[PDB]
Amino acid sequence: SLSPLAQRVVTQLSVMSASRKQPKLLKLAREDLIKHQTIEKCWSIYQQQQRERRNLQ
Amino acid sequence: VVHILGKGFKGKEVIKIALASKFYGIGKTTAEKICSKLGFYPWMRMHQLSEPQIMSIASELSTMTIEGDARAIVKDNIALKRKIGSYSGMRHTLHLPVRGQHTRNNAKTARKLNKIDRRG
Amino acid sequence: TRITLPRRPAKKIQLGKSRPAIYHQFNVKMELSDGSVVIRRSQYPKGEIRLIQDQRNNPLWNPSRGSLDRFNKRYSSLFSTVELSEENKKKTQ
Amino acid sequence: SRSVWKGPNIVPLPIREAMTKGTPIRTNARAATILPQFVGLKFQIHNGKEYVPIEISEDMVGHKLGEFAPTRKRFSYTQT
Amino acid sequence: RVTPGSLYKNWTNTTHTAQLQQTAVPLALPIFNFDDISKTLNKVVSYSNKQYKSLHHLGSFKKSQFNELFQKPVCLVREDATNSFLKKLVSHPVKKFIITGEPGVGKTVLLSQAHAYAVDSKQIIINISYPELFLNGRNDFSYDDDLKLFIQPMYLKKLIRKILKANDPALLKSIELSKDYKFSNANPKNASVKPFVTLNKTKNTVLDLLSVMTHPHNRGKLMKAIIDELSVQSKVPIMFTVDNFSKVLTTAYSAYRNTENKQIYSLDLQMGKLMMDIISGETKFANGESSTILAISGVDRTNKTLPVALGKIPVDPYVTRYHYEPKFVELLQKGNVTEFEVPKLNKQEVNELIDYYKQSNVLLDKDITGKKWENLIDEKYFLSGNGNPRELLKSLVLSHR
RNA sequence: AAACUCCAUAUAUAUAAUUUUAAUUAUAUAUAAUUUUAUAUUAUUUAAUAUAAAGAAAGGAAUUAAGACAAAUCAUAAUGAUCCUUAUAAUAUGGGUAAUAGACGUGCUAUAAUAAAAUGAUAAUAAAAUUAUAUAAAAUAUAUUUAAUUAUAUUUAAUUAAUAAUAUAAAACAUUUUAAUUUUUAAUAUAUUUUUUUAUUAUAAAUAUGAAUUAUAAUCUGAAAUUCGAUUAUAUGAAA
RNA sequence: AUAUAUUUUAGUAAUAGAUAAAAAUAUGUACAGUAAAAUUGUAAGGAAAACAAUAAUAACUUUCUC
Ligand SMILES: Nc1nc2c(ncn2[C@@H]2O[C@H](COP(=O)(O)OP(=O)(O)O)[C@@H](O)[C@H]2O)c(=O)[nH]1
Ligand SMILES: [Mg+2]
Ligand SMILES: [Mg+2]
Ligand SMILES: [Mg+2]
Ligand SMILES: [Mg+2]
Ligand SMILES: [Mg+2]
Ligand SMILES: [Mg+2]
Ligand SMILES: [Mg+2]
Ligand SMILES: [Mg+2]
Ligand SMILES: [Mg+2]
Ligand SMILES: [Mg+2]
Ligand SMILES: [Mg+2]
Ligand SMILES: [Mg+2]
Ligand SMILES: [Mg+2]
Ligand SMILES: [Mg+2]
Ligand SMILES: [Mg+2]
Ligand SMILES: [Mg+2]
Ligand SMILES: [Mg+2]
Ligand SMILES: [Mg+2]
Ligand SMILES: [Mg+2]
C-alpha cells in the first residue's frame, strides 16, 4: 500500500493539516460577547492613543 | 522465545555468547563483564533467566553505548573523514579498499560494502 | 516515474466556516551563549533550550567585546609562541 | 613519529611569515603532521606533479598534509 | 531424526550410558569383605549388593573405566595395594590419606574398595567424585551473607541427595541433633501453610535434616548445619572422600566471577572451603575411625603444589601461583596427610586378571587359541608397562591392531 | 651411458684427560655390493620365477651429449655496429612502480564433530642452521586482580659458540567444550548406568563455523609509515 | 502500582479563502476581482525554473489626537 517514506510524508502532512486536530467553535453568551466587545474596543482605542502619542513625538 | 532489548533469543543459548552474537556494541569481554555485574553463572542459558534478571540485563544494555548508537558513531567518523578532502574519505566515497591494499585483483568485499553509510 | 501521493476527494470547506490554522505552540525559553534568556513561541515540545553558538558570542555581532581536542589530549605530556618560534625557519619555501 | 610518545612529525616551514601576512606555504613535505598552530593558514601541498591549494580547518589537526593532496588520478575504463 | 533405542552419544559416553553390560555372562564370584580378606587376598571379587547400591549412589564407578565388560563393576583384592591401604586406615591415629600414583594404576578402584569397606563397617560416606562440577562454573551460585562465601545450590542439593541415598537410614537416623534448626520451606505441598520448617534438638534426626527442602539461598545454610551435626556426633564414623582432588589443587581459582569482573577463589566458595576445612585439622569429627581419603587423577593438571605438600621436593619460593599455590600446601601440612602410592601390578596379579577376563569371555580368539598361556601373560605385562591395569585392559580388549 | 664423486648406511682404526660431552656423539682414514651361494620349476650351457642361508645392506643428490628451437638474457657483466654529448650523461625534493571494468595463472585461508577450540612445569618426543653491519636469557612494568598465556616496554645475564642465545618443537596422546540437533538444558521426583538413568513439565539454511571489510586506540622499525609497512587491543563479522 | 471487563480514541492525507491568471467540469445563474510584459533583486539558479517588489491621493466618511 505505502512505503515507510510515504508514511512519514503523510505524518508530516498531518502535522500541518487541520484534519481532526481542531476544537469546537468558541461560542459565547450575549453578556459575555458584550464584555468581549468592550475589552477589544477599549484596547483598540488605547493602541490608537499610543500611536498618536508616538507619532506626535 | 526469551526476548531482551528487542532482540529475540532461542532457549539453551548461553547468555554471554548470545549477547555477543546479537548486540552490535558488545563482543566477548563486554558480555562477560555484564554477566558478572548481574551475577549469572558462566554458561547459564537464556531460558533460565527470570523476569527481573531480564529487566536488569536490559537496563545494563541501555546503560552501555550499543546497537544503533554504536553504529552511528562509526558512520559519523566516516562522514567526518569524507568532509575533509582526505584519501580515506575519498576511498569510502568511491567504494574501494581504504587500508592501503591492492586492487588490480581481489577488491570485491570493499566494493560491496565500503559506503559512507556502512553498517546494515 | 514521478513519485507522488495520489489525492483523495477534497473536503468541502463551506464559505464562512473556514477556520484559521492555530497550531499548537509552547512558550520556549532560549538562554543564549551568555545568561540572557528570551521567551519564544515554538511548535516543538521543549520548555527550555540553552544555545552554544549565538550572535552574543560571535565576533561579527560584537566587534568591540573534535580532532584538535583529541590532538591536545594525546600530545599533552609534551605541551606542544615558543614552540612556533623554534619550528619556523622561513628560508625554505 | 606515529607513536604517541615522541610525536608529532614536525618539519621546518615558513609559518610565522604566513601568519603575519597571507602568503601560502608551498609544502613538499607530505609527511608533516598538521598542528593546532596552523589552522587557517593556506598550504600548497605537493602532489608529485602540481602543488595543491588547501586551507587547513580544525578537523585536519591530527592528519598529515599529504593525505589531502591525492597523487593518482581517479580511475576510469574506456569502454571500447 | 533419532529414536529412543539408537545410540546418539560419542564413544566414551555411549560405553558409560548405553547398557551394553546387559549382554554379559553371570559370574559366581566371591564377595568383598575386609573381615575375610585372608580367604580372597589375591582373587577377583564382586561387591556385595548393599555395597554396590551405596557405591553407585556415591559415584565410585566411573565412565572411562571398562565396567561395561562385566555384569557389574568388579575388582580384585591386592596384598601390596588395597589390603595394605585398608590396614593403614584401620591402624593409623590420624586416618588421613591421599591416593597417589601413575595414570590408570587404580586409584578410583582403591577409593571404591575403601567406600565398600566403610559400608560394611557401619559408616557414613560423604563422597565428592568429580569436584570439577563445583569448581568449574557450570551451575548457579550466590554470595551468602551469613556465611562469608559463595554457595552453589544446584550442586549442593545433588550432594545432599547422594549422601541421603548412598547411606542406610538406620545408621543415619541413629544420630540426634545438637542444635535446633529453622529453614525456609520449599515443598509443593504446605507452601502457604508452613512458611518455615523447624528441626528440634532431641526429637528430630539427621535423616530428617537431610530430607529438608529449602530455597537456593538456604541450601548452603542447610549444608553447613549438616556438616556441623556430623562433626558433633560420636556414634558413627564419617568417611569423607574426594576423587580427582588434583583438579582442586591445581584449579585454585574457579570460573565464577563476582560483581566486579574477576575470578572467584576456590576457598571463597562454600564447597571448596568446606572440603579444605575437612581435610585440615579444623572441622574435627568427634568419633574415631572417621577418615578423609583423597585421590589424584592423571586426567588433571600436574604442578609443584602436591609434591611440595608431601615429602618430595623442597619449597621453591619463586615458582608462580599457577604452578605452586602455597596456601593449599599449608592446609595439607596442617591436617597430617600421609600419602599412599598405588603400586603397579605384579606378574601373578596380572595373570589372575587375565584368567578372570578369559572366564568372563573378554579375551580375543588370537590371544586364547594357538598360544602358550605364560607367554601371553608375559606379553601382556610387557605391553602394560609392567602392570598398569588400565593399559593392560586396553591391550587385551581395545587393541585390534 | 655406466663407473669413479657427494649425502646417507654398516663395520673397523685413530682422536676427545666423557666439564665445549651429544661417546646414544663428531671427523679423518679405510673396508663393504652394479650383492653372493644353492635346491627346484618353465623354457632353451644359460635365463626368469619360487624356495632357502649369508649378509646392515635399501635410497637420494650432482652430472642432462651432439644438434636444434635466429628459444631466453645488451636490465648481472662485458663487447660490435649505431644513436645522445647543456643531454638519451649527473645530483636533490616529492610522486610512481602498490592505479582498477572485465579476464588469466600461481598460492593462502576457509565453508565444523573419521574435526575445530581451552588446558597439560619433576616442562612427551626432533633435526638442520644462524648469532662483531649481532643472538638477546632471566627478572620487572603495562594490556589483565590473582597467575599463566600472548603482545609490547624496562634492561642486557651469557656467547661471537660442539661451551650461551635464537628455542620448554608441533602434531601426537589425555581431560573439557562444541551450533546446526527437544541428538540439549533445569524444576521436580526417580535409582544397583549417579561426570549418569527414567518419568513429567518448561526449553520455538551461516553458528559458540569463517575472518573478508571497516571504526577507534595503542605499540614497532626508521630521520620519515599520507599515497605506502608490521603488530596488539576493543568493536565490526562479507562471501563461502 | 498492577490485572480483567467495558468503552473511547489512532485509518494519522493537503483546500481553512467566496480562494482570483499553476493545473483541473468548456453549457445556467449569483457574487467578486484583474491580466501581461519589462525592470530591480534573491540558496543551488545560469538567456531560460520560483518568490518578492515597481503610477497618482486632491476631495469624502469613520476613528484617535494637537
Ligand atoms: N586396582 C585395580 N584397578 C583396576 C582393576 N580393574 C580395573 N582397574 C583399572 O583401574 C583404573 C582406575 O585408575 P585411576 O587411577 O582412577 O586413573 P586416573 O583417573 O587417570 O588416575 C581403571 O582405568 C581400571 O581399568 C582392579 O581389579 N584393581
Ligand atoms: Mg554483535
Ligand atoms: Mg580418577
Ligand atoms: Mg654417470
Ligand atoms: Mg657422553
Ligand atoms: Mg646438447
Ligand atoms: Mg630471436
Ligand atoms: Mg637465440
Ligand atoms: Mg651493447
Ligand atoms: Mg652496462
Ligand atoms: Mg641524466
Ligand atoms: Mg611488480
Ligand atoms: Mg612458479
Ligand atoms: Mg572447524
Ligand atoms: Mg624473558
Ligand atoms: Mg645452548
Ligand atoms: Mg612443551
Ligand atoms: Mg551464505
Ligand atoms: Mg571465529
Ligand atoms: Mg580458526
Coordinates of N, CA and C in Angstrom, one line a residue, chain E residues 121-188:
Chain E
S121 N 31.4 -51.8 57.5 CA 31.7 -51.5 58.9 C 30.8 -50.4 59.5
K122 N 29.6 -50.2 59.0 CA 28.6 -49.3 59.5 C 29.2 -47.8 59.7
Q123 N 29.5 -47.2 58.5 CA 30.0 -45.9 58.5 C 29.2 -45.0 57.4
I124 N 29.1 -43.7 57.7 CA 28.5 -42.8 56.7 C 29.6 -42.4 55.8
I125 N 29.3 -42.1 54.5 CA 30.2 -41.8 53.4 C 29.7 -40.5 52.7
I126 N 30.6 -39.5 52.8 CA 30.4 -38.2 52.1 C 31.4 -38.2 50.9
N127 N 31.0 -38.7 49.8 CA 31.8 -38.8 48.6 C 31.6 -37.6 47.7
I128 N 32.7 -37.0 47.2 CA 32.7 -35.9 46.2 C 33.6 -36.4 45.0
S129 N 32.9 -37.2 44.2 CA 33.5 -37.6 42.9 C 33.4 -36.5 41.9
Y130 N 34.5 -36.1 41.4 CA 34.5 -35.0 40.3 C 34.1 -33.6 41.0
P131 N 35.1 -33.0 41.6 CA 35.0 -31.6 42.1 C 34.9 -30.6 41.0
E132 N 35.4 -30.9 39.8 CA 35.2 -30.1 38.6 C 33.8 -29.5 38.4
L133 N 32.8 -30.2 38.8 CA 31.4 -29.7 38.8 C 31.2 -28.4 39.6
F134 N 31.6 -28.4 40.9 CA 31.6 -27.3 41.8 C 32.7 -26.3 41.5
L135 N 33.8 -26.7 41.1 CA 35.0 -25.8 40.8 C 34.8 -25.0 39.5
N136 N 34.6 -25.7 38.4 CA 34.3 -25.1 37.2 C 32.8 -24.5 37.2
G137 N 32.6 -23.4 36.5 CA 31.4 -22.7 36.6 C 30.3 -23.1 35.6
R138 N 29.6 -24.1 36.0 CA 28.5 -24.7 35.1 C 27.2 -25.0 35.9
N139 N 27.0 -24.2 36.9 CA 25.7 -24.3 37.7 C 25.6 -23.0 38.6
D140 N 24.4 -22.8 39.1 CA 24.1 -21.5 39.8 C 24.9 -21.3 41.1
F141 N 25.1 -20.1 41.4 CA 25.8 -19.8 42.7 C 25.3 -18.4 43.2
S142 N 25.7 -18.2 44.5 CA 25.2 -16.9 45.2 C 26.1 -16.6 46.4
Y143 N 26.4 -15.4 46.6 CA 27.1 -14.9 47.8 C 26.1 -14.9 49.0
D144 N 26.3 -15.8 49.9 CA 25.5 -15.8 51.2 C 26.1 -14.7 52.1
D145 N 25.2 -14.1 52.9 CA 25.6 -13.0 53.8 C 26.1 -13.5 55.1
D146 N 25.4 -14.5 55.7 CA 25.7 -15.1 57.0 C 27.0 -15.8 56.9
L147 N 27.1 -16.8 56.0 CA 28.4 -17.5 55.7 C 29.1 -16.6 54.7
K148 N 30.3 -16.1 55.0 CA 31.1 -15.2 54.1 C 31.8 -16.0 53.0
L149 N 31.0 -16.6 52.1 CA 31.5 -17.4 51.0 C 30.3 -17.7 50.0
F150 N 30.7 -18.0 48.7 CA 29.8 -18.2 47.6 C 29.2 -19.7 47.7
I151 N 27.9 -19.8 47.9 CA 27.2 -21.1 47.9 C 26.8 -21.5 46.5
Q152 N 26.7 -22.8 46.2 CA 26.3 -23.3 44.9 C 25.1 -24.3 45.1
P153 N 23.9 -23.8 45.0 CA 22.7 -24.5 45.4 C 22.0 -25.4 44.3
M154 N 22.7 -25.8 43.3 CA 22.3 -26.9 42.4 C 23.2 -28.2 42.7
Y155 N 24.5 -28.0 42.7 CA 25.5 -29.0 43.1 C 25.2 -29.5 44.6
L156 N 25.0 -28.5 45.5 CA 24.8 -28.8 46.9 C 23.6 -29.8 47.1
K157 N 22.5 -29.5 46.5 CA 21.3 -30.3 46.5 C 21.6 -31.7 46.1
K158 N 22.3 -31.9 45.0 CA 22.7 -33.2 44.4 C 23.5 -33.9 45.4
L159 N 24.5 -33.3 46.0 CA 25.4 -33.8 47.0 C 24.7 -34.3 48.2
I160 N 23.7 -33.5 48.7 CA 22.8 -33.9 49.8 C 22.0 -35.1 49.5
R161 N 21.5 -35.2 48.3 CA 20.7 -36.3 47.8 C 21.5 -37.6 47.8
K162 N 22.8 -37.5 47.3 CA 23.7 -38.6 47.2 C 24.0 -39.1 48.6
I163 N 24.3 -38.2 49.6 CA 24.5 -38.5 51.0 C 23.4 -39.3 51.6
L164 N 22.1 -38.8 51.3 CA 20.9 -39.4 51.8 C 20.8 -40.9 51.3
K165 N 21.0 -41.1 50.0 CA 20.7 -42.3 49.3 C 21.8 -43.4 49.5
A166 N 23.1 -43.0 49.3 CA 24.3 -43.8 49.5 C 24.3 -44.6 50.8
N167 N 23.9 -43.9 51.9 CA 24.0 -44.4 53.2 C 22.6 -45.0 53.6
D168 N 22.6 -46.0 54.5 CA 21.4 -46.7 55.0 C 20.8 -45.7 56.1
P169 N 19.4 -45.7 56.1 CA 18.7 -44.8 57.0 C 18.8 -45.1 58.5
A170 N 19.0 -46.4 58.9 CA 19.1 -46.9 60.3 C 20.3 -46.3 61.0
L171 N 21.5 -46.4 60.3 CA 22.7 -45.8 60.7 C 22.7 -44.3 60.8
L172 N 22.0 -43.7 59.8 CA 21.9 -42.3 59.6 C 20.9 -41.6 60.6
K173 N 19.8 -42.3 60.9 CA 18.8 -41.8 61.9 C 19.1 -42.3 63.4
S174 N 20.2 -42.9 63.6 CA 20.7 -43.1 65.0 C 21.2 -41.8 65.6
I175 N 21.4 -40.8 64.9 CA 22.1 -39.5 65.3 C 21.0 -38.5 65.6
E176 N 20.9 -38.1 66.9 CA 20.1 -36.9 67.3 C 20.9 -35.6 67.1
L177 N 20.1 -34.5 67.0 CA 20.8 -33.2 66.7 C 21.3 -32.6 67.9
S178 N 22.3 -31.7 67.8 CA 22.9 -30.9 68.8 C 22.2 -29.6 69.0
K179 N 21.8 -29.0 67.9 CA 21.0 -27.7 68.0 C 19.7 -27.8 67.2
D180 N 18.9 -26.8 67.4 CA 17.6 -26.6 66.7 C 17.9 -25.9 65.4
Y181 N 17.1 -26.1 64.4 CA 17.4 -25.5 63.0 C 16.1 -25.1 62.4
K182 N 16.0 -23.8 62.0 CA 15.0 -23.2 61.2 C 15.4 -23.1 59.7
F183 N 14.6 -23.5 58.8 CA 14.8 -23.4 57.4 C 13.6 -22.9 56.7
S184 N 13.8 -22.3 55.5 CA 12.7 -21.9 54.6 C 12.1 -23.2 54.0
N185 N 10.8 -23.3 53.9 CA 10.1 -24.5 53.3 C 10.1 -24.3 51.8
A186 N 10.2 -25.4 51.1 CA 10.1 -25.4 49.6 C 9.5 -26.7 49.1
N187 N 8.4 -27.2 49.7 CA 7.6 -28.3 49.2 C 6.5 -27.7 48.2
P188 N 6.0 -28.6 47.3 CA 4.8 -28.3 46.5 C 3.6 -28.2 47.5

